[PDB]
């Protein structure tokens, strides 16, 4: 319960002096997840958990210092809550549509799916965070940002985009959608200003729902992604045609 939580927080060196992190961890993570994090720490993948980056309805995201490839890396640790709507994105994906989606296994299969989508995208040259490892409902990946503060998402940039190469940023997004579709053969299926981050270039995040092109709604998901992106960049002065961008992505 609460004693079980405190021991793992102590073990993870998540201290009260660190602001509200400890109170947040203790509420958003349950005993089973904390144990998994401790397993990853004791195995040597995690050096030290840090700040809480995001708390959500499906997942929570934390900063961590860890080790991957025998080097110390800044990590984002993305954790799916052990406890619906996502199902069309799970069933109907060929890689999972003949598998046993048990209720008590479902969240773990989702985490796995995101990890495999990250590897798939990354290896096809799409800008996503380098995936490092995963265990149960825990994903360890490359931290996008510096000095423990996450790069802004596009929506967090907002008007600041007018102070940037907004057309260039748009073209970066389109090029990544095109690589995702053509080389990785995936459709993001929830692409928006809420899951594109920007440092010196764009990175796509939140790939749990991405489906291969063999998913029967894949082309519908794509056009939804493309319309979504064009409409968002329209607010910041990017003039783009749906037809042309969709053809560009698909290779027509
Ligand atoms: N996947 C992932 C990540 C999510 N986030 C954060 O959580 C928020 C929720 O999406 C987002 O607004 C961003 O602020 C990340 N931050 C740094 N590196 C990462 N790899 C991630």
Residue numbers in the entry: 3 to 85, 90 to 258
Paper text:
Rio1 kinase is the founding member of the RIO family. Rio1 is involved in ribosome biogenesis, cell cycle progression and chromosome maintenance. Previously solved crystal structures of Archaeoglobus fulgidus Rio1 (afRio1) and Rio2 (afRio2) have shown the RIO domain is a trimmed version of the ePK catalytic domain with an additional conserved N-terminal α-helix. The afRio1 structure consists of an N-terminal domain (N-lobe) that consists of a α-helical region and a twisted β-sheet that contains the phosphate interacting loop (P-loop) and an α-helical C-terminal region (C-lobe) that houses the catalytic and metal binding residues.
We hereby present a crystal structure of toyocamycin bound to afRio1 at 2.0 Å resolution and employ structural analysis to characterize the interactions. The completely refined structure contained two molecules of the afRio1/toyocamycin complex per asymmetric unit with residues 3-258 for each molecule. The N- and C-lobes are connected by a hinge region, and between the two domains is a cleft that buries the 7-cyano-7-deazaadenine ring of toyocamycin. In the afRio1/toyocamycin complex, part of that flexible loop, residues 86–90 in chain A and residues 86–93 in chain B, are not observed in the electron density map. An overlay of the toyocamycin and ATP binding sites demonstrates that toyocamycin binds to the same site as ATP. Toyocamycin is buried in the active site pocket that features hydrophobic contact with Val 63, Ile 55 and Ala 78 from the N-lobe, Pro 156, Met 147,Phe 149 and Ile 150 from the hinge, and Met 203 and Ile 211 from the C-lobe. In addition, toyocamycin participates in ten hydrogen bond interactions. In the structure of the toyocamycin complex, the largest interface (836.5 Å2 per molecule) is observed between the two molecules of the asymmetric unit. The largest interface for both the ATP (766.6 Å2) and ADP (768.4 Å2) bound structures is the one similar to the largest interface in the toyocamycin complex. This interface positions the helices of the C-terminal lobe of one molecule (monomer A) in contact with both the N- and C-lobes at the opening of the active site of the second molecule (monomer B), almost completely occluding that active site. Specifically, in the adenosine bound structure, the backbone carbonyl oxygen bond of Ile 211 is pointing into the ATP binding pocket, while in the ATP and toyocamycin bound structures, there is a peptide flip that positions the Ile 211 carbonyl oxygen bond in the opposite direction, resulting in a 3.8 Å shift in position of the carbonyl oxygen.
